[PDB]
Design a protein around this ligand. Structure first.
Ligand SMILES: Cc1cc2nc3c(=O)[nH]c(=O)nc-3n(C[C@H](O)[C@H](O)[C@H](O)COP(=O)(O)O)c2cc1C
Ligand SMILES: Cc1cc(Nc2ccc(S(F)(F)(F)(F)F)cc2)n2nc(C(C)(F)F)nc2n1
Ligand SMILES: O=C(O)c1cc(=O)[nH]c(=O)[nH]1
Length: 374
């Protein structure tokens, strides 16, 4: 439509002139007031996908950190995405690091950030997710759309687990899945939770808290899980790419022993030095330059877990081609972030088109057939 096209001009303009986090908040606001366009197209039934009994109408969603506070869930989903991951949230509100903390290099289609864990806190965000869930009962276009919640610990909290336990109790009833990220380069001490021993501990503790939600309520699943699945939320974990081969296999074991529901590969990276505008900057890099690193990480973990744990792709996905690399590498689902920044609101419509056409030309019957074909 012209709707998309006109908006994308405004965005390209904003991208050139205006600060990144200012732009982000501006368009989140436009989405909050529901003046963004819709993709009302039927999605190809041949590009369906799932992770266990969690079904996605199409294989593209938005990654955590994009709508941290769940203020814009409807509008973003209606751009053509099958799901969104809100957060990362923490039990208490944070301001995050000092601004500016997000910068973009257009030529390389990359971003670096040191947001450091800004969100309105779990309590307020739960009210936002509840309001959405109420809207979802009335909106034809939100049916079968999935909302995951990314959860993490406040800055100065001694134990991670006590933070996540609070988050699950408050918001776990409204979530279709829970993403645990011990993968973030913006707060010190988070990533050491990636050891196998502490991880196993965290993962178990999360499943037990979710399982406890079921036990302590007296209602049936219909009137207990105020989400889309109407079941208890799945448990994913998100991994940073800056690990060595021993760490990755050590972790790979854990995820199996815990029987986790999926792994999100990957988060941002600190190991990129060839971006000129970014040399002054600290933080984690995302976008195109993260693409090849990310994909490799999927192949590794796909092999190390011996293909029992489903994978969710994140890192430099812009095109239907990029998407297929992640799928053949072993991903069931893809998440976009940087693409929305650089390609705009058309990204979902566009990338779904490109992938559908490729699946044809590559002779795939459906998307599931292509999963892990390396
Ligand atoms: C400004 C910014 C904030 C982010 N915040 C989070 C976050 O809070 N939690 C999280 O798991 N990932 C966060 N991410 C990482 C994204 O979820 C995603 O994994 C990463 O950007 C790679 O996607 P991409 O290459 O398509 O951009 C953030 C990324 C950016 C650029
Ligand atoms: C022009 C621009 C846009 C943008 N993000 C963005 C882009 C579009 C939308 S949306 F979701 F318009 F409908 F697609 F609201 C939401 C967020 N960001 N995000 C950043 C950043 C990297 F700072 F977060 N810079 C941006 N610049
Ligand atoms: O919000 C952040 O600080 C953040 C979290 C994360 O997981 N990855 C990232 O790059 N930034």
């Amino acid at each position: 439509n012209p709707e998309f096209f006109l908006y994308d001009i405004f965005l390209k303009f904003c991208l050139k002139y205006i600060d990144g986090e200012i732009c982000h908040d501006l368009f989140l606001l436009l989405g909050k007031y529901n003046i963004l366009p819709y993709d009302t197209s039927n999605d190809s039934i041949y590009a369906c996908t799932n992770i266990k009994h969690l079904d996605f109408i199409n294989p593209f969603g938005v990654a955590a950190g994009f709508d941290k506070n769940g203020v814009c869930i409807d509008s973003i989903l209606k751009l053509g995405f099958s799901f969104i991951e809100i957060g990362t949230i923490t039990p208490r509100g944070q301001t995050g690091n000092a601004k500016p903390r997000i910068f973009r290099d257009v030529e390389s289609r990359s971003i670096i950030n040191s947001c450091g864990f800004n969100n309105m806190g779990c309590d307020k965000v739960t009210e936002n997710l509840i309001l959405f869930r109420k809207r979802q009962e009335e909106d034809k276009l939100l049916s079968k759309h999935i909302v995951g919640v990314s959860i993490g610990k406040n800055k100065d909290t001694v134990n991670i687990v006590d933070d996540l336990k609070y988050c699950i109790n408050k918001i776990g009833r409204y979530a279709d899945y829970i993403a645990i990220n011990v993968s973030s380069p913006n707060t010190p001490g988070l990533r050491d939770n990636q050891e196998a021993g502490k991880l196993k501990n965290i993962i178990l503790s999360v499943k037990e808290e979710i399982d406890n939600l079921e036990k302590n309520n007296i209602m049936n699943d219909e009137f207990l899980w105020f989400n889309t699945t109407k079941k208890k939320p799945l448990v994913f974990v998100k991994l940073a790419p800056d690990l060595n081969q021993e760490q990755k296999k050590e972790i790979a074991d854990v995820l199996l022993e815990t029987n986790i529901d999926g792994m999100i590969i990957s988060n941002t990276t600190t190991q990129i030095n060839d971006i000129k505008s970014f040399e002054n900057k600290k933080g984690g890099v995302s976008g195109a330059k993260l693409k090849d690193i990310s994909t490799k990480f999927i192949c590794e973990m796909y092999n190390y877990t011996n293909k029992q744990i489903p994978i969710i792709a994140s890192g430099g996905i812009f095109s239907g081609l990029d998407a297929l690399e992640k799928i053949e590498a072993g991903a069931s689902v893809c998440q976009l972030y940087s693409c929305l920044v650089f390609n705009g609101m058309k990204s979902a419509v566009q990338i779904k088109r490109e992938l559908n056409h490729l699946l044809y030309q590559r002779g795939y019957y459906n998307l599931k057939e292509a999963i892990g074909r390396k």
